[PDB]
Design a protein around this nucleic acid. Structure first.
Ligand SMILES: [Mg+2]
Ligand SMILES: [Mg+2]
Ligand SMILES: [Mg+2]
Ligand SMILES: [Mg+2]
Ligand SMILES: [Mg+2]
Ligand SMILES: [Mg+2]
Ligand SMILES: [Mg+2]
Ligand SMILES: [Mg+2]
Ligand SMILES: [Mg+2]
Ligand SMILES: [Mg+2]
Ligand SMILES: [Mg+2]
Ligand SMILES: [Mg+2]
Ligand SMILES: [Mg+2]
Ligand SMILES: [Mg+2]
Ligand SMILES: [Mg+2]
Ligand SMILES: [Mg+2]
Ligand SMILES: [Mg+2]
Ligand SMILES: [Mg+2]
Ligand SMILES: [Mg+2]
Ligand SMILES: [Mg+2]
Ligand SMILES: [Mg+2]
Ligand SMILES: [Mg+2]
Ligand SMILES: [Mg+2]
Ligand SMILES: [Mg+2]
Ligand SMILES: [Mg+2]
Ligand SMILES: [Mg+2]
Ligand SMILES: [Mg+2]
Ligand SMILES: [Mg+2]
Ligand SMILES: [Mg+2]
Ligand SMILES: [Mg+2]
Ligand SMILES: [Mg+2]
Ligand SMILES: [Mg+2]
Ligand SMILES: [Mg+2]
Ligand SMILES: [Mg+2]
Ligand SMILES: [Mg+2]
Ligand SMILES: [Mg+2]
Ligand SMILES: [Mg+2]
Ligand SMILES: [Mg+2]
Ligand SMILES: [Mg+2]
Ligand SMILES: [Mg+2]
Ligand SMILES: [Mg+2]
Ligand SMILES: [Mg+2]
Ligand SMILES: [Mg+2]
Ligand SMILES: [Mg+2]
Ligand SMILES: [Mg+2]
Ligand SMILES: [Mg+2]
Ligand SMILES: [Mg+2]
Ligand SMILES: [Mg+2]
Ligand SMILES: [Mg+2]
Ligand SMILES: [Mg+2]
Ligand SMILES: [Mg+2]
Lengths: 271, 93, 46
RNA sequence: AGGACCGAACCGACUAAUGUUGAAAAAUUAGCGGAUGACUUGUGGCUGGGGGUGAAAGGCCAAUCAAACCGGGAGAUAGCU
RNA sequence: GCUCGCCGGAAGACCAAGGGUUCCUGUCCAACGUUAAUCGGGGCAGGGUGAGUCGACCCCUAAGGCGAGGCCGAAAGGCGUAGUCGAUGGGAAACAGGUUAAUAUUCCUGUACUUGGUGUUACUGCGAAGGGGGGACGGAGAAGGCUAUGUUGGCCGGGCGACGGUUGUCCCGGUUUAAGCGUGUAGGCUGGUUUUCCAGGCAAAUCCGGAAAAUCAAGGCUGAGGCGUGAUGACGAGGCACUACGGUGCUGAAGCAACAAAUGCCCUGCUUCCAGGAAAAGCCUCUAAGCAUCAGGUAACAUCAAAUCGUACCCCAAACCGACACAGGUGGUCAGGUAGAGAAUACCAAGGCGCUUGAGAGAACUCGGGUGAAGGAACUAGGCAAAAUGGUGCCGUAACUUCGGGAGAAGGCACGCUGAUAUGUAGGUGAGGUCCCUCGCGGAUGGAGCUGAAAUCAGUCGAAGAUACCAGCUGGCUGCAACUGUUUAUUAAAAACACAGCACUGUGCAAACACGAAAGUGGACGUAUACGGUGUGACGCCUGCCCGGUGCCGGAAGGUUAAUU
């Protein structure tokens, strides 16, 4: 549910929370947890490579099954959980052999639902199979780019892909960006859409809320001195520059894709 | 565990003072200067063989040598090991 | 007020100690220059 | 419940007087703002000089940073005093 | 030595860091000490730091470092795998009293506890670098049970008062006791046992996970404190002897209850929220290779071992960072009385101090204060500075508003003390006695004793009862920025920066982008509801026209056009 807050204080007036009562209260499933190391957007040279990353709540990593290789063995959804590592929710699934795994929670999946993977699996939400065995026109998510590599496309909350065509050893997908992309039919995909579509309806309401998410402030280039950014100084508010990145490269309009190796798979670019 | 050559080099001197005299009269403890590297086991064995008395317990501390200034240049006395060797009720020497 | 020198022996030794000098080529060059100068103390030690 | 309210510690630094060969190379006193948070603090770590870091003031990077400090080229050059 | 004054959430005490003998004793006074100095953190000499259980080392990992081979790079080198290091975090065990001129949880006295080796004895499936469990985790809030601690009474010892009274409903002081061991409470969590089967836990498992039956409603786990023991003891005002008059030896009363009560403990709990909250070992258990009358495992008793280094002293400062015995700076712990909401503030206790030039005088003028006739902003750039307001309760409170606010708006009334209701009330706490019982640290009944605000009525003192310290000035119009935040350490705190929100634009993942001649890495263990860049800046009502110029995006026919030939 999407909930508005009463204006009992100024940083609370514009807050719009996504509150999901279906999600597990408390701690996750400990065996599927790994430690997460915060970067501050710094690399192995200790330099900031990506700006505006730092602080924010400590998070544990949940091992998510993007491969969905446990074929023939059915599984039941035990509970839906909150995962701090992604926009989407995850599901704790129990296999008939006693194994537990985490999966991305599709739209509509609830506790008690039965899922399965493999070439023979039923066409239902939460089921994974190679796209050669999923009908054309189907709405899928957690789509593999290479067979057996694991799900790489349509993983974010509310996202999905539509198999628009199948010809030869390849399928044509309408990606969430609007791009028409070819991927080989032997790549797996999960039926349904990623759940939690109400995610985009949230309104942080205050500065502190982006800070808890590890987002540090953005300083406008125009708010700097010539030495720091091509968007320089000026006596009073001045611009008169062709808008660029801090590194003097044309922001707004210049295409930065340069991958001749993967061009063959793009059928139609996004608009 | 021991060797006579080692035990003969481990005890260096009796240490004299008011504290050392009172430790003997009140607690039957002898205060000694022992080799810097001497262990409590070595001091126990050396006192038993050379002084022919029974040892109850050995307590040890390291004394830091005092520094004296001679104008612009400093001098430093040596650090040494002190042993509080408690002998059993039956006292001799 | 708060001055620039805030002591810590661990940070002193890690930053400027003998082993830290020995760890890099340029630090072994510091020791070599100081030895050629005839320095009494090559590094701050115990 | 809250980057909620009043207010010590704690963090800060709006006004004035004093001090200005100072008690102090930035303070003292009376008042002042924040005080569950984008809070504050200890210990240790990482980023290095056309480089870092910067809620951006050319700020800060060991008491003078529009290019630190030390050693060297070095007796730079000085149609100037 | 007797007074006087100051601090007392510190100006006391204890840690860490940092220092390094400054510590204690004797002796000396040149220089050091802003003065004298017989004194000193100064000179000289001697003395002083005692550990199985306090810390380090040690075992274990975090960020991060290093890194055999390796990958990469003119050389130097960069990165990184197995690994190996690295606390600020995890991992065995000791307390009370006494003692020194100076150490003490280290010595001594009393009483304990931990983990190993060895031996004996009884019982026995033991075995890891592996599996599983556990360790092992956030914020906020609630309020119950406690203890630390205090207050009063009782008890015991002492007192009978320099000046009216003081044998009493009087005065003063003490009334302290640990770890450990036994009991398993208030309270928290969870159904328990057995059998069979199994695509999971890299191999195996009797363990974990999963499945299916059977049976019992009570089973276990966690747990403050209390009570008992420890303690036949220690401590204890004082008494009695000796005193080098500094002290020393001997002796030693009472040692209880009620009430109040933490921010400490139960509580790593409970409730609740979103921002969703280390690791690894010790530990418990399970098996593999293996050993299978052995070894090994479990228990009782005995015995041995537990090394090494630190330990003095200063520590919110005269010993550390500040050139100084410098109004500065410096992390953690403890928290007595009265008043008080309080860790504010005032006065005090314990404890520590009067700040290392003093003596006079009582001019101008400077600094810091107190009071001020009449006037009351006339001052000035400007009410700068002052002065003023200031508490609790109740009554009451406008425009406007995003319905929260505005609001403590504004303004008003009450306020001490004494008595009565009631020799102390409402409430809190709760003993005896009686009764039940799956007999306990149990339940019900019962109300003694203790503690105890507030109200009304009546009276009373003063000029004044929130009497001191402490402690909002209030209101109206208007510019700017929504807001809380941030900033020019050291002349600018703002209207500047940031901000939630909005938009443009790039980016299909070996992403764009960024640090790197590279390898590697960040972005991200993310995947277009995502990530980067740019601008605008809550919200409301909205955001028109212009593509000539400059920038960008798309186009392929023609013209021009590089190396090359
Ligand atoms: Mg500027
Ligand atoms: Mg340009
Ligand atoms: Mg001993
Ligand atoms: Mg020792
Ligand atoms: Mg607040
Ligand atoms: Mg002040
Ligand atoms: Mg205010
Ligand atoms: Mg406040
Ligand atoms: Mg630091
Ligand atoms: Mg030259
Ligand atoms: Mg010259
Ligand atoms: Mg000295
Ligand atoms: Mg002294
Ligand atoms: Mg003098
Ligand atoms: Mg001296
Ligand atoms: Mg190598
Ligand atoms: Mg390396
Ligand atoms: Mg290690
Ligand atoms: Mg540590
Ligand atoms: Mg002492
Ligand atoms: Mg044995
Ligand atoms: Mg394990
Ligand atoms: Mg919680
Ligand atoms: Mg009590
Ligand atoms: Mg009289
Ligand atoms: Mg119970
Ligand atoms: Mg006595
Ligand atoms: Mg000490
Ligand atoms: Mg101290
Ligand atoms: Mg002084
Ligand atoms: Mg000082
Ligand atoms: Mg402080
Ligand atoms: Mg105070
Ligand atoms: Mg003085
Ligand atoms: Mg005067
Ligand atoms: Mg007047
Ligand atoms: Mg008047
Ligand atoms: Mg008037
Ligand atoms: Mg005027
Ligand atoms: Mg005038
Ligand atoms: Mg004023
Ligand atoms: Mg005033
Ligand atoms: Mg009246
Ligand atoms: Mg105007
Ligand atoms: Mg503002
Ligand atoms: Mg503000
Ligand atoms: Mg300034
Ligand atoms: Mg200022
Ligand atoms: Mg702007
Ligand atoms: Mg326009
Ligand atoms: Mg073009």
């Amino acid at each position: 549910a999407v909930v508005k807050c009463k204006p009992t204080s100024p940083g609370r007036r514009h807050v719009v929370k996504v509150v999901n009562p279906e999600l597990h209260k408390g701690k996750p499933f400990a065996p599927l947890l790994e430690k997460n190391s915060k970067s501050g957007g710094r690399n192995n040279n200790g330099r900031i490579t990506t700006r505006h990353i730092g602080g924010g709540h400590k998070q544990a990593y949940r091992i998510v099954d993007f491969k969905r290789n446990k074929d023939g063995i059915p599984a039941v959804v035990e509970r839906l959980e909150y995962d701090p590592n992604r926009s989407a929710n995850i599901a704790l699934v129990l296999y008939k052999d006693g194994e537990r795994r985490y999966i991305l929670a599709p739209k509509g999946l609830k506790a008690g639902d039965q899922i399965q993977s493999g070439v023979d699996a039923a066409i239902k939400p939460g089921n994974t199979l190679p796209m050669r065995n999923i009908p054309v026109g189907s709405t899928v998510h957690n789509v593999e780019m290479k067979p057996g590599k694991g799900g790489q496309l349509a993983r974010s909350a509310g996202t999905y892909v539509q198999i628009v065509a199948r010809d030869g050893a390849y399928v044509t997908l309408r990606l969430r960006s609007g791009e028409m992309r070819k991927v080989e039919a032997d790549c797996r995909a999960t039926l349904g859409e990623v759940g939690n579509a109400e995610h985009m309806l949230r309104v942080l309401g205050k500065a502190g809320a982006a800070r808890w998410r590890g987002v540090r402030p953005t300083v406008r280039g125009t708010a700097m001195n010539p030495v720091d950014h091509p968007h320089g100084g000026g006596e009073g508010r001045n611009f008169g520059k062709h808008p660029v990145t801090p590194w003097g490269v044309q922001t707004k309009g210049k295409k930065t894709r340069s991958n001749k190796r993967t061009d063959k798979f793009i059928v139609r670019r996004r608009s | 565990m021991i060797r006579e050559e080692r035990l003969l080099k481990v005890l260096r001197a009796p240490h004299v003072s008011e504290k050392a005299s009172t430790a003997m009269e009140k607690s039957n403890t002898i205060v000694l200067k022992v080799a810097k590297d001497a262990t409590k086991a070595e001091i126990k064995a050396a006192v038993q063989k050379l002084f022919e008395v029974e040892v109850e317990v050995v307590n040890t501390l390291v004394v830091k040598g005092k520094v004296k200034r001679h104008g612009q240049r400093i001098g430093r006395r040596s650090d040494w090991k002190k042993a509080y060797v408690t002998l059993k009720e039956g006292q001799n020497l | 007020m708060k001055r620039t020198f805030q002591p810590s022996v661990l940070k002193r030794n890690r930053s400027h100690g003998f082993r830290a000098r020995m760890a890099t080529k340029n630090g072994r060059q510091v020791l070599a220059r100081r030895r050629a100068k005839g320095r009494a103390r090559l590094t701050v030690s115990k």
